[PDB]
Design a protein around this ligand. Structure first.
Ligand code: 9B0
Ligand code: ZN
Ligand code: ZN
Ligand code: ZN
Lengths: 66, 61, 85, 815
């Protein structure tokens, strides 16, 4: 429960999906050749891709329900 | 065998003693750095700085 | 009330007593000790300086994780000292 | 109301004799409460309880933490009480307890951070000029603590002012003592402020008062010791006065100046170190003749410090330093002097470490024969230290003869059994090695005479010597009176003292372990039946040495005793796997392995299965360990068929024993199990389909140990097959079964991979029933905490809805 990203019987789809999006972005920031792949694919500098991922970290999957 | 071992010891001891005899013929005040105790024998810049401090404490109060 | 401490471990080495000498602190196995145990600073202080991590008696030798616990990275949690409340 | 706050701040008793949860709760609440309670009542009550004459150590620690937290919050309201607190806690800084000192320093540090520098200075300044020497020491230590807390440059002006005071010499003395205590307390952190402190204290070396000069020299020594091995440009204005003073002073001040010189010399270059050593060396040689003993200790320390630098070379040392050193310090008066004895030994060893072993060793080896035995033990200690640190290479024929004769005469002339002569003899013979051929007859005669009689405290020392020297005894190609010694050691096998029996067994083992079983005199078929009743002795040393000896015999001389006696010995060793001591268990494991390798796995395995069938719990567990040992020494191919044939018995409590044995077998063999997973898979299937709960729990344990044993060896097929049978047990309420199932699942997470586990959890993560969701989320959290990173590549695709975006688009890029 103290670890961030764990769930329980009341976990919703939104929390699950934002958790996997957030650690996906962190894994992209960590691994050197995944960021290379993305920066070649979208034709940007690697610093720009890193900053874009950090900016996307705040609200991935949009704002929550109700 | 035990008697021989006892003999061997006796002879070695005798040889050492003879050599020794041969050689012999041929031939506090207490103080500590942990104390300031000296043995027998027996304007100002500190007040100015103190006055400057006293002034700061009085002003704060 | 057998609960692990689970605080940030420091530079202090865990100790075992004469009764627990060969034991693993987490699974209580005796086979293949592999990794030296580290404990936090509140477990290593004053009267607590040298003590068995399993029971709390006078330590005599180093505590170790087993190869099985090292493979599963169970040596990466906090202080493994058994603390009672 | 006043006692209102008192009755409510009995929170400190809530904490003192209280539980840890309410301990921390009351801690937090009293931290929130402190600013409103006020420092007056809080301190008025806590300082008595900290002054309690019989408080504990950890109660004191918790009180200090309470002080820290209630001091952080109330910052500038603690001023009017500072003085009072100090009079309570200015002691605890000269206390003989280390942790009391740490706690006092922490309290004073938090107090200085709470209050200001001006307040601390204003309360501490009146006691600077006190006449009671007990106050001027705590004041200096507290000023050092305040400097360590608030920084050195914040106190530098007050220091510069106080040790220029022309009012009294006590203020100057206390300021220099503050600098010294700052150095002592902070260590190598004073290096950026070294020159500032040195220029603040340097003018005291030429004072008109002799106490100021001494404390200035001590402060310089402290700074130089804190700075090493850095900082010599900052010690430049002190070189002239210090050396002029050692040239003019005499006595206590001379000792302080010499200590300063000795701590400063190792910071120089070869030139200055070489040039300065000459001066201080003529002065030190003059001071060799001093009657005072403090002076002797300081001179020895300075000699050791200076002779360890590069600017001083062995030529100058042997030409100028060694004659007076050995003429003035090596007399038995030094030996009965217990204070400087260790200092002399260390200084001599560190001299030999630069000038060469031969000269030192000769000059003291002629002195091994002496009327006083204190002077003998001293020489022996020094000699064996030098021998262990450098060796016996440049020791020659005359020196070798003298060494051997001296150590032999010292061995015989021995009143009480000491470890000094034993270790000296051992290391001398071990360093000489194959060079001592005729002194081998001589030493054998000596140890024969010592081992023959005299109270068995000489006999056990002789046995220790044999045990530690038998290697070089036999490697010199000599075996006969080696057997003469072994015969006598054998006759010394009935002893009422277990301590002597341990040494006897150790010597016998060292003999039989180093000489070959070939061509050796005392027969094994005589030693072993005499040896087997000693295995039941209850002393730890006797037991360990007996087990080691039986193990060596079984390893090398296995063909000299019948297999029936080996079977009896192994069945007796079975009970020693429960020993409370680790060395007994280690030796027992080794010896059981040797006996099993010797007599063959078949008969011992049959006996072990019979024993596993009929006995109580602990003996059955030991039998399981023994089966695992047999299967590891003799390949598990020889054990597995007979063990699987026992699972065929149609009776519970027999199959469960087979399952426990398989569990421990796989856990014990680890990587070797990669060739045997296909053989035990149908048995584990059968056990996992069984209604009995212990069957399934033990099968899960086996699966876990097998999974963690084979990892990186390509055994995923059988492990997935077995997971297909383990998984249906997740809905089990029995705690032991579910514990074993969780263990097996976490082992399969490593051996099989997290992708398969996520594939098993996906459909249950969002089941309508809360039981399924609880179980699956527990399993999922266990999979997620380990290998969170791998799961990134395994998550399934989830489509966007009208409100939210769920596709990860970056992974869809195609270069
Ligand atoms: C179910 C088993 C039981 O829990 C049992 C182990 C234990 O609970 C009982 C209590 C008690 C006191 O009777 C026994 C306890 C423990 C033992 C008999 C172990 O031995 C010791 O304590 C002595 C010491 O810890 C080291 C023993 C040692 C090295 O044999 C140890 O095993 C190992 O380290 N191994 C076995 C595996 N072996 C191979 C060889 C290749 C490379 C190394 C790893 C794999 C290396 C050596 C365990 C042995 C006994 C189970
Ligand atoms: Zn473990
Ligand atoms: Zn213990
Ligand atoms: Zn801890």
């Amino acid at each position: 429960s103290k670890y961030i990203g764990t769930g329980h019987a009341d976990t919703t789809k939104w929390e699950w999906l934002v958790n996997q999006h957030r650690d996906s972005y962190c894994s992209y920031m960590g691994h050197f050749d995944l960021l290379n792949y993305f920066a070649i694919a979208e034709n940007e500098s690697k610093a720009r891709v890193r900053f874009n991922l950090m900016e996307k970290m705040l609200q991935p999957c949009g704002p929550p329900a109700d | 065998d035990q008697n021989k071992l006892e003999e061997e010891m006796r002879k070695r001891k005798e040889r050492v003693e003879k050599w020794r005899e041969e050689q012999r013929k041929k031939a506090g005040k207490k103080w500590s750095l942990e104390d300031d105790d000296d043995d027998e024998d027996d304007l100002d810049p500190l007040d100015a700085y103190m006055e400057e401090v006293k002034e700061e404490v009085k002003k704060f109060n | 009330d057998l609960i692990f401490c689970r605080k940030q471990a420091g530079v202090a080495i865990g100790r075992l007593c004469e009764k627990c000498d060969g034991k693993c602190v987490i699974c209580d196995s005796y086979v293949r000790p592999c990794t030296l145990v580290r404990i936090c600073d509140e477990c290593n202080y004053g009267s607590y300086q040298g003590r068995c991590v399993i029971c709390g008696g006078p330590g005599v030798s180093d505590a170790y994780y087993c190869k099985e616990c090292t493979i599963q990275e169970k040596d990466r949690d906090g202080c493994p000292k058994i603390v009672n409340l | 109301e006043e006692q209102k706050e008192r009755k409510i701040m009995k929170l400190l008793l809530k904490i003192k004799n209280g539980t840890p949860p309410m301990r921390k709760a009351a801690l937090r609440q009293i931290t929130d409460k402190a600013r409103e309670f006020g420092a007056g009542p809080l301190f008025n009550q806590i300082l008595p309880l900290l002054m309690s004459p019989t408080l504990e150590d950890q109660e004191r620690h918790l009180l200090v933490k309470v002080i820290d937290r209630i001091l952080y919050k109330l910052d500038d309201l603690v001023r009017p009480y500072v003085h009072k607190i100090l009079v309570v806690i200015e002691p605890l800084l000269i206390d003989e307890d280390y942790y009391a000192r740490v706690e006092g320093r922490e309290i004073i540090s938090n107090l200085a951070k709470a209050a200001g520098l001006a307040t601390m200075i204003s309360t501490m300044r009146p006691d600077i000029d006190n006449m009671d020497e007990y106050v001027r020491n705590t004041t200096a230590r507290a000023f050092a603590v305040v400097a360590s807390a608030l920084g050195i440059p914040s106190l530098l002006p007050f220091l510069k002012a106080v040790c220029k005071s022309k009012k009294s010499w006590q203020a100057r003395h206390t300021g220099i003592k503050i600098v010294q205590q700052i150095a002592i307390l902070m260590g190598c952190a004073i290096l950026p402020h070294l020159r500032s402190l040195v220029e603040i204290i340097e003018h005291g070396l030429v004072d008109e008062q002799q106490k100021v000069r001494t404390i200035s020299a001590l402060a310089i020594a402290a700074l130089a010791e804190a700075a090493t091995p850095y900082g010599i440009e900052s010690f430049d204005s002190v070189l002239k006065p210090l050396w002029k003073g050692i040239r003019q002073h005499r006595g206590k001040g001379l000792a302080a100046f010499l200590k300063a010189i000795g701590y400063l010399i190792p910071l120089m270059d070869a030139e200055y170190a070489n040039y300065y050593t000459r001066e201080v060396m003529l002065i030190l040689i003059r001071e060799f003749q001093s009657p005072d003993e403090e002076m002797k200790k300081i001179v020895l320390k300075v000699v050791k410090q200076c002779c360890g630098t590069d600017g001083v070379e062995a030529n100058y040392i042997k030409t100028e330093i060694l004659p007076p050193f050995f003429k003035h310090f090596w007399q038995h008066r030094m030996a009965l002097d217990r204070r400087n004895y260790r200092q002399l030994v260390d200084t001599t060893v560190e001299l030999a470490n630069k000038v060469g072993a031969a000269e030192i060793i000769s000059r003291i080896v002629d002195d091994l024969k002496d009327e006083a035995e204190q002077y003998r033990k001293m020489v022996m200690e020094t000699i064996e230290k030098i021998m262990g640190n450098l060796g016996a290479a440049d020791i020659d024929h005359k020196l070798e003869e003298q060494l051997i004769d001296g150590i032999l005469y010292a061995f015989q002339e021995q009143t009480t059994e000491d470890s000094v002569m034993l270790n000296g003899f051992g290391t001398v013979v071990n360093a000489l090695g194959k060079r001592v051929k005729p002194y081998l007859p001589q030493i054998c005669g000596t140890v024969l005479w010592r081992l023959n009689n005299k109270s068995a405290k000489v006999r056990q020392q002789a046995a220790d010597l044999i045990s530690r020297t038998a290697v070089v005894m036999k490697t010199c190609q000599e075996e006969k009176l080696m057997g003469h010694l072994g015969v006598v050691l054998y006759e010394y096998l009935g002893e009422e003292y277990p301590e002597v029996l341990g040494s006897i067994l150790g010597a016998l083992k060292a003999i039989v372990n180093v000489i070959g079983m070939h061509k050796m005199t005392p027969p094994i078929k005589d030693l072993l039946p005499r040896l087997t009743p000693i295995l039941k002795n209850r002393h730890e040393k006797v037991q360990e040495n007996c087990i080691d000896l039986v193990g060596r015999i079984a390893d090398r001389g296995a063909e000299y005793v019948s297999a029936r006696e080996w079977m009896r010995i192994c069945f007796e060793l079975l009970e020693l796997l429960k020993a409370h001591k680790k060395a007994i268990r280690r030796a027992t494991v080794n010896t059981f392995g040797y006996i099993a390798k010797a007599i063959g796995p078949h008969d011992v395995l049959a006996t072990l299965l019979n024993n596993l069938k009929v006995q109580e719990r602990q003996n059955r567990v030991c039998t399981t360990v023994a089966i695992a040992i047999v299967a590891e020494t003799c390949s598990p191919f020889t054990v597995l068929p007979a063990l699987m044939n026992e699972y065929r018995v149609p009776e519970l409590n027999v199959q469960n024993g087979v399952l426990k044995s398989l569990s421990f077998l796989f856990e014990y063999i680890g990587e070797m199990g990669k060739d045997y997973i296909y053989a035990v898979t149908p048995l584990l299937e059968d056990a996992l389909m069984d209604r009995d709960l212990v069957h399934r729990q033990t099968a899960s344990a086996v699966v876990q140990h097998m999974s963690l044993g084979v990892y990186g060896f390509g055994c995923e097929d059988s492990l997935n097959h077995l997971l297909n049978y383990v998984w249906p047990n997740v809905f089990e309420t029995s705690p032991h079964v579910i514990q074993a199932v969780m263990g097996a699942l976490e082992g399969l997470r490593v051996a099989i991979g997290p992708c398969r586990m996520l594939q098993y959890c996906l459909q249950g993560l969002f089941h309508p029933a809360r039981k399924v969701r609880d179980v699956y989320w527990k399993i999922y959290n266990s999979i997620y905490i380990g290998s969170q990173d791998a799961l990134i590549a395994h998550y399934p695709r989830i489509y966007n809805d009208d409100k939210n975006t769920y596709i990860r688009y970056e992974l869809d890029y195609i270069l």
